[PDB]
Design a binder for this molecule. Structure first.
Ligand code: ADP
Ligand code: ADP
Ligand code: ADP
Ligand code: MN
Ligand code: MN
Length: 1657
């Protein structure tokens, strides 16, 4: 068939196009009448093509991966469309809309032009669905992350591979459920390994976890289609489609020409003559250089100008000849293209998009006959031509430095443009090349070039990536990975061309081959320090250097050289030298033709180049410099080499910068970041910063750079002063805008010395620049650096992100808390710098001076843990006391050392020992001595949190209620009138600090408070906890009491190992020998503690990343013992359960943590209330968090203690309530997000010690284990305070208003001098002398201390008087409460909430007003905010009548405002939001009664609507509503059925449905549809639950009735029914009603609190 024709110079080979052969089988194309949802994208077509026909069934129904092969222009993108359509249908409602946050789809294309054309096409075609298609482009992660918040994303393989390597977007990467790979034949190219890595890791994860993501490959007509088909896991019967060149819509005639190359130009000119003059067909030529396009076009046109052949090519129509040049030459800006009046065109992507679209539209209209172009036009257009001419096939690739043949994908995409199907009946594709290249391209176009792997050239690096991801931990996992690559599939079959060696004859699945290959790669990876490699165990772990080598594409050799060369004294010269030394440019040669220009270029550059002027290193150096300087280069190969160098520089310089940053070298790090910016913005630091603005005209830059005004003098100016300073009035308004948007930040810093060697710094960053999305986007990144006074070492570094929402708000400031070490010969100062990550000259630098800093007191040694004889239980002189400890014959080493002081002495005692040592038995020693006394006074045990008092009560009530004739052990409750009688009725009272506070406030009254003889303060360190200031207050008040009354009162305190136990001891007035402060290493079961650091800036990605390491920790450190994993939130608890279950699925052991057969557990599993918890427990994991029901918690506890399940995942919010024990404790998170400040706050050391204190189960070696996973920045912090004792400091100085409100409500404090003596009884006062700088004390003198206390009490009294809570008589200097601190202390609401409650009474308060004012209380601001819980709040807000004045969607105020209304409307809620609603309902009643009393204090009578709202929220109803909602099972439709019968109130309902009365008993029972039991419950409510009985000039009132509780099944716990007495309206009285009452009120409306519609008028 092929005709060979030999000529003078060239040898033509014509291959005839095979016949269409399109109707041997009558495969009628589908009608494309699909459902209504899958038709709108196919706008301009009614019939699918022949290719899409056989793919439509599998595409639209079958989910399996597939691969189609066809010629270019055949219709593959439409089968990819069909796959996207099956997915959109998957995410579509029956007839409703589509949830677009549930799924993502990724389209991978080889070049940028194709991704842009594809994003445009798919945007147009998918816009009616609301789907937003976007291109994954950024120079920054801040752009790519926001681009990952879209539905379908189009990207290149390199960008996708690099965003997956960073692992900082896994939270969204997991949401992809479909991937399309266009032009897979790239696998043959040197970039194929990127595709290999992508698909290998994706398919491996899918086959491990079972989470399906569809893979569809669209390749070209090629031989090895079955290889890549199996490599994509497609079914050869149902997923593999292959089509001949006859399935091409326009058959392609192929002639090959082979010829140093002037004959090529002559042949192109003669073919232009033949095809445009004789055949009159427009044609396009493809060349491989932007300048060579116009070079060849100019040659052809000049050759046509001579010999007078131009009139054959030229069109002579009066229209074309007159319109073409008029609309093109007069409107073109390209000087070299301006030669287009002769029908010629150039299109090489180095021209304006305006000129580009003009050329394209002109070629489409038929005005251009010869269009010469680059490969950029081949990819991503819709411009076909009859004749395409690939002029030349050799191109320069600066990677290898040698001339390389053209990529086989470019020639195919080019020849695809040959022959427009609608106009032409055939196309012509010609390839001009050299003779020797003829057999290469022929076989390529005639389906004979096979695809081979190039992974061997990039294996090592790629392997390292899989190791940095945590996907490859050992050689076996690496072999599993390498078993999914294309190299493996190409090794299995046809291994001869690969130098396998043939020694692996019996290698069944090439297992040993992959093992050997991965070991050989990991050896080189280990030598270069990119990885730790256990050569024998097979274990391997990535390093920080390997992480840098993976996140950026840096080669292993280059990273090795960077590690070898970089040192802290490095300058800009040596930095450029290290850059040019990189191995990416070693093939780039220095040529003789380059020297004449290289000498000049080196003369121009500013940085000295010391290498030999003729060495490649100097060439690469001067190339980078000259690119920075924006020098014009008249050299072709030189320009190509520079383009390559500068494309690599972006990653090379960032890798160098991160290396310097992680080595702690400050100067080199800042210099490397500045060089990064130099190459990114293409400017030197000595040029004008205005060069960073693209819209800034060059005139301004030149004027500025010819000036000497420093950059800082541009800021804080207006347009007139700006123009005056700049010397250009016209520039005034312009430049002032640009500078106004330059990233600018003001910083402040506060220093508190935690210890003598570690300071804590609070940095306050406030942005000071106008935001603009064109150059800022939505976020702006910064670096926070902390340096020595010498600028030598980096003491702290982190990233700091400005969000556009947070940077534009009124409350504009951000806070950042960190810790830095310090040496006792203190340095003069530290430095803090906030430096932009992309902008140049954007740095705010602040000194932190230490001349005023005073370090805390040295710590004294811990008390020696003496080696005593373990005292037997018989040392107790009672048999019943010894029976309290069954089967115990001794006590531990610390219980015997405190025994004499606690059991034989009534002195005050302090015991400080690690968690889990047994301090409860010390408290029991004290209690046993107390109860031995015949008097046996009352004892009071206090614990920081109700969880702890409950755990203690459940134990002591069953173990000690039988001693010495029986003791009454009680625990307090919320309100006062009941636990006040529990105090008198009991001998041992357990309480929380606040509960006992409300009782000890009434001392010198309520005689039963002084009689307390024993006071146990457990977990005393928690005085520095969440609400620890009230704890400090109550213990100091007990001391003050036992000072006022002279009766003896013992105090015994228990805490974890302290660093400052002297002050806590002397505080409770304990003697020196009674203060036991043991080392934090004396725990009876030692604790092997591992620490893992994580450099991951995205929180969900960090959690997902830690997921698998904790599985490894559990399976390797505690393989046959229970483990407990703590997690930052209850929301993340189920997520971590699922992640750990999937990690179990990764190995072929799904029930790894399940030991008992599931059938025994099945009952409890059925009884689990949460379906996710039941699914987890089904496979032996389970979890525990505050939203769980009591039954769920008890089931989880029964399952974990019995050993049926091995792991237990608990949120950090339940670590005090968790009555569990493990051999291994994992601390996954160290931070938790607090929605109040929009930031992550660190775990307080208190709860880390608490969580690790549950690792009490030992092993063979007699020790327990813990692991602590944290961000790197935090490691040295926690590590420190896990090897040393815990410093406890007071925060009473930060809550003095809320303490004085209670000390002034009672007349304890009555003046300023009356408050200093109160402060002297506190722990804060004793701490002021030991750590004065922590609290702001300047001089450590009695004068200074007393003056500081005076200033503090005066500013607290000022905050209170300015808030209108107390009268402050400044003359006498006294204070008094004014009818508002009473309410505050009675309901214990915050003082800031009290001041906020002043906004009422202005005009007056209404129902809709009070509903909004209550939820604004600060108590609800503590409620957690789960990220991305918006929308489910807006949907609820749209379904409630009363609206907010100004919505703030992420505000806890708006959250409470909406949830209260959802409670009124009985709207269902998800579990976590329902828990938040419960928490709100717990306090809304207290807040509402406080508001009632506040309104009653003045004249206004809006408080009545507040009482109505109280009864509303009790009954979950609205103000105006049918009371029948209170009746059980009365859905709104039943209320409608009742209203149809004439029922309006519960009274009228009770009067109806009575046999022989109102004869509707027949139809009413039938229409209500209620069962007999529902009617019985309704009768239960209506009979004796809903009330029925009703009732200075003084008044007298009576009331009677026909009792214990209130019927309100939608409210957690409600005190018995109360009543209001309301006669600018004055009188109020609040009393409970029982059976009968007679009360007379004196004045100068009978309302309820729990039921509606019962109101005397
Ligand atoms: N069923 C059809 N009816 C009409 N035109 C079609 C049909 N299928 C594909 N085309 C057109 O054929 C051209 C080939 O484009 P495309 O299919 O995206 O490239 P490829 O064939 O390389 O996937 C497109 O411009 C498209 O509009
Ligand atoms: N490095 C940082 N600097 C400042 N704020 C941060 C930083 N990281 C997170 N934040 C805060 O946390 C929120 C982002 O939470 P996160 O889950 O980490 O990212 P995402 O925005 O993807 O949810 C932002 O509102 C931001 O204010
Ligand atoms: N002398 C002892 N020998 C063995 N186990 C003990 C001893 N004292 C306490 N325990 C165990 O310690 C657990 C409780 O420790 P706890 O008293 O809470 O210590 P801490 O209060 O310091 O956390 C109990 O389960 C108990 O069995
Ligand atoms: Mn394609
Ligand atoms: Mn304890």
């Amino acid at each position: 068939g092929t005709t060979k024709r030999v000529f003078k110079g060239y040898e033509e080979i014509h291959v005839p196009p095979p016949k269409k052969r399109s109707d041997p089988t009558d495969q009628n194309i589908p009608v494309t009448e699909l459902p209504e949802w899958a038709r709108i994208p196919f706008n301009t077509t009614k019939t699918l093509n022949k290719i899409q026909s056989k793919c439509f069934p599998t595409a639209f129904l079958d989910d399996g991966n597939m691969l189609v092969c066809a010629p270019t222009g055949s219709g593959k993108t439409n089968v990819a469309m069909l796959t996207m359509l099956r997915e959109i249908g998957k995410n579509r409602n029956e007839k409703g809309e589509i949830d677009l946050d549930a799924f993502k789809i990724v389209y991978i294309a080889p070049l940028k032009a194709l991704v842009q054309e594809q994003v445009g096409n798919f945007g147009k075609r998918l816009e009616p669905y609301g789907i937003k298609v976007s291109e994954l482009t950024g120079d920054r992660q801040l752009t790519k992350q926001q681009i990952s918040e879209t539905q379908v994303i189009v990207t290149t393989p390199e960008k996708w591979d690099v965003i997956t390597r960073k692992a900082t977007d896994i939270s969204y990467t997991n949401l992809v459920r479909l991937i399309i790979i266009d032009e897979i034949h790239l696998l043959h190219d040197d970039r194929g390994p990127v595709l290999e890595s992508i698909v290998s890791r994706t398919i491996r994860r899918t086959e491990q976890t079972g989470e399906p993501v569809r893979i569809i490959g669209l390749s070209a007509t090629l031989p090895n289609y079955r290889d890549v088909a199996s490599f994509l896991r497609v079914d050869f019967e149902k997923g593999l489609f292959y089509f001949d060149g006859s399935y091409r819509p326009c058959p392609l005639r192929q002639e090959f020409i082979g010829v140093q190359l002037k004959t090529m130009n002559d042949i192109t000119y003669q073919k232009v003559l033949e095809h445009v003059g004789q055949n009159r067909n427009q044609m396009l030529i493809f060349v491989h250089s932007r300048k060579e396009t116009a070079k060849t076009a100019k040659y052809i046109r000049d050759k046509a100008l001579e010999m007078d052949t131009i009139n054959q090519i030229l069109k002579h129509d009066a229209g074309t000849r007159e319109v073409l040049q008029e609309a093109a030459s007069s409107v073109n800006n390209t000087d070299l293209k301006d030669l287009l009046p002769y029908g010629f065109g150039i299109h090489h992507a180095g021209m304006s998009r305006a000129d580009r679209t003009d050329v394209e539209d002109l070629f489409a209209s038929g005005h251009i006959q010869v269009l010469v172009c680059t490969a950029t036009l081949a990819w991503g257009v819709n411009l076909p031509a009859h004749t395409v001419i690939i002029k030349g096939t050799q191109v320069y690739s600066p990677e290898k430095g040698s001339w390389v043949e053209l990529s086989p994908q470019d020639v195919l995409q080019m020849l695809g443009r040959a022959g427009r199907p609608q106009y032409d009946t055939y196309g012509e594709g010609i390839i001009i090349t050299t003779q020797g290249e003829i057999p290469y391209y022929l076989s390529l176009l005639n389906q004979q070039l096979p695809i081979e792997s190039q992974l061997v050239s990039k294996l090592v690096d790629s392997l390292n990536a899989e190791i940095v991801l945590g996907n490859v931990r050992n050689r076996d996992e690496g072999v599993e990975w390498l078993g999914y690559t294309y190299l493996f599939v190409r090794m299995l079959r046809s291994p001869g061309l690969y130098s396998v060696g043939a020694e692996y004859e019996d290698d069944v699945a090439l297992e040993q081959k992959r093992v050997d290959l991965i070991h050989s790669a990991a050896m080189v990876l280990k030598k270069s320090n990119l990885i730790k490699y256990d050569e024998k165990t097979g274990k391997m772990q990535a390093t920080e250097l390997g992480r840098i080598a993976s996140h950026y594409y840096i080669s292993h050799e280059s990273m090795d050289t960077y590690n070898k060369l970089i040192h802290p004294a490095m300058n800009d010269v040596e930095l450029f030298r290290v850059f040019a030394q990189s191995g990416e440019f070693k093939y780039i040669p220095v040529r003789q033709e380059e020297k004449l220009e290289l000498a000049k270029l080196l003369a121009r550059v500013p940085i000295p180049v010391k290498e030999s002027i003729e060495e490649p290193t100097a060439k690469i150096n001067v190339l980078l410099q000259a690119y920075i300087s924006r020098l014009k280069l008249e050299g072709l190969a030189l320009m190509a080499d520079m383009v390559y160098v500068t494309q690599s520089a972006g990653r090379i310089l960032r890798a160098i910068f991160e290396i310097c940053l992680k080595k702690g070298w400050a100067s080199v790090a800042k210099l490397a970041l500045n060089m990064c910016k130099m190459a990114e913005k293409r400017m030197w630091p000595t040029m004008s910063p205005l060069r960073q603005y693209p819209t800034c005209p060059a005139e301004i830059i030149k004027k500025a750079e010819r000036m000497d005004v420093p950059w800082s003098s541009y800021f804080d100016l207006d347009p007139p002063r700006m123009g005056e300073l700049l010397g250009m009035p016209k520039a005034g308004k312009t430049v002032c805008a640009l500078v106004s948007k330059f990233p600018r930040v003001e910083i402040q810093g506060n220093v508190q010395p935690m210890t003598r060697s570690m300071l804590r710094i609070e940095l306050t960053i406030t942005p000071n620049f106008q935001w603009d999305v064109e150059l800022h986007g939505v976020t702006e990144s910064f670096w926070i650096l902390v340096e020595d006074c010498d600028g030598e070492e980096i003491l702290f570094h982190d990233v700091f992100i400005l969000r556009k929402d947070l940077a534009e708000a009124e409350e504009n400031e951000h806070t950042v808390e960190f810790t830095v070490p310090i040496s006792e010969p203190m340095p003069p100062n530290y430095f803090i710098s906030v430096i932009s990550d992309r902008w140049m000259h954007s740095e705010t630098r602040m000194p932190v001076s230490f001349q005023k800093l005073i370090l805390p007191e040295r710590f004294p040694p811990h008390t020696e843990l003496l080696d005593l004889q373990p005292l037997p239980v018989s040392a107790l002189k009672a048999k019943d006391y010894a029976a309290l400890y069954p089967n115990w014959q001794q006590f531990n080493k610390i219980q015997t050392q405190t025994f004499n002081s606690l059991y034989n002495t009534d002195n005050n005692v302090l015991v400080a020992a690690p968690t889990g040592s047994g301090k409860t038995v010390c408290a029991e020693f004290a209690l046993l001595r107390h109860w031995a006394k015949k008097d046996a006074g009352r004892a009071v045990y206090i614990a920081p949190f109700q969880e702890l008092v409950d755990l203690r009560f459940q134990d002591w009530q069953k173990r000690l209620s039988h001693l010495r004739g029986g003791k009454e052990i009680v625990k307090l409750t919320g309100e006062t009138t009941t636990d006040l009688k529990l105090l008198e009725q009991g001998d041992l009272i357990l309480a929380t600090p606040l509960q006992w506070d409300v009782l000890s406030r009434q001392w010198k009254r309520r005689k039963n408070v002084q009689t307390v003889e024993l006071f146990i303060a457990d977990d005393l360190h928690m005085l520095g906890g969440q609400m620890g200031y009230i704890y400090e207050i109550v213990v100091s008040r007990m001391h003050f009491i036992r000072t006022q009354t002279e009766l003896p009162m013992r105090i015994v305190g228990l805490s974890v190992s302290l660093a400052n136990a002297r002050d806590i001891g002397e505080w409770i007035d304990a003697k020196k020998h009674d203060i036991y402060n043991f080392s934090p290493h004396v725990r009876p079961v030692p604790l092997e503690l591992h620490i893992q650091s994580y450099t991951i800036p995205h929180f969900p990605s960090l959690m997902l990343a830690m997921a698998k390491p904790t599985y490894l920790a559990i399976t390797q450190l505690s393989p046959d013992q229970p483990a407990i994993v703590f997690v930052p939130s209850r929301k993340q608890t189920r997520a971590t359960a699922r992640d750990l279950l999937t990690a179990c699925l990764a190995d072929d052991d799904e029930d790894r943590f399940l030991h008992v057969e599931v059938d025994q557990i099945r009952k409890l599993l059925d009884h689990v209330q949460e379906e996710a918890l039941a699914e987890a427990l089904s496979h032996g994991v389970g979890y525990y968090h505050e939203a769980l029901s009591q039954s769920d918690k008890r089931i989880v506890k029964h399952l974990y203690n019995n050993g049926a399940i091995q792991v237990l995942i608990a949120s950090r919010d339940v670590c005090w309530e968790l009555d569990f024990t493990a051999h291994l404790v994992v601390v996954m998170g160290t931070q938790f997000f607090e929605g109040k400040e929009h930031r992550y706050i660190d775990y307080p050391l208190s709860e880390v010690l608490q969580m690790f204190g549950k690792a009490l189960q030992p092993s063979k070696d007699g020790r327990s284990r813990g692991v602590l996973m944290l961000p790197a920045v935090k490691r040295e912090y926690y590590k420190k305070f896990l090897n040393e004792a815990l410093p406890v400091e007071s925060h009473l100085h930060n809550f003095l208003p809320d303490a004085f409100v209670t000390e002034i409500s009672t007349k304890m404090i009555e003046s300023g001098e009356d408050a200093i003596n109160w402060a002297t009884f506190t722990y804060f006062y004793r701490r002021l002398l030991a750590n004065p700088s922590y609290y702001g004390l300047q001089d450590p003198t009695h004068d200074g201390l007393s003056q500081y206390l005076s200033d503090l009490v005066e500013t607290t009294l000022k905050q209170l008087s300015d808030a209108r809570i107390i009268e402050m008589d400044e003359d006498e200097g006294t204070v008094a409460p004014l009818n508002a601190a009473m309410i505050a202390a009675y309901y214990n609401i915050s003082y800031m909430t009290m001041e906020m409650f002043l906004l009422s009474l202005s005009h007056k308060s209404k129902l809709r007003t009070i509903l909004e004012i209550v939820t604004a209380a600060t108590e609800f601001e503590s409620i957690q905010t789960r990220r991305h819980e918006e929308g489910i709040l807006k949907r609820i807000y749209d379904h409630v009548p009363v609206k907010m004045n100004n919505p703030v969607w992420d505000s806890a105020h708006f959250k409470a405002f909406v949830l209260v209304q959802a409670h009124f409307s009985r709207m269902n809620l998800p579990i976590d939001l329902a828990k938040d609603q419960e928490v709100i309902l717990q306090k809304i009643l207290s807040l509402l009664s406080a508001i009632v009393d506040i309104l009653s204090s003045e004249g206004h009578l809006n408080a009545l609507n507040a009482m109505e709202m109280s009864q509303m929220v009790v009954q979950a109803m609205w103000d105006r509503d049918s009371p029948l909602k209170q009746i059980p099972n009365f859905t709104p439709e039943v209320v409608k059925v009742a209203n149809k019968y004439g029922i309006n109130d519960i009274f009228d309902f009770m009067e109806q449905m009575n046999p022989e009365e109102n004869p509707n008993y027949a139809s009413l029972v039938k229409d209500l549809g209620l069962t007999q039991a529902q009617l019985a419950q309704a009768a239960n409510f209506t009979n004796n639950k809903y009330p029925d009985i009703t009732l200075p000039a003084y008044l007298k009132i009576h009331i009677e009735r026909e009792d214990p509780t209130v019927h309100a099944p939608f409210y957690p716990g409600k005190k018995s029914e109360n009543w209001w007495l309301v006669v600018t309206l004055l009188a109020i009285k609040r009393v409970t009603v029982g059976k009968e009452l007679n009360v007379k009120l004196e004045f100068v409306f009978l309302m309820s609190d729990s039921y509606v519609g019962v109101d005397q008028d």
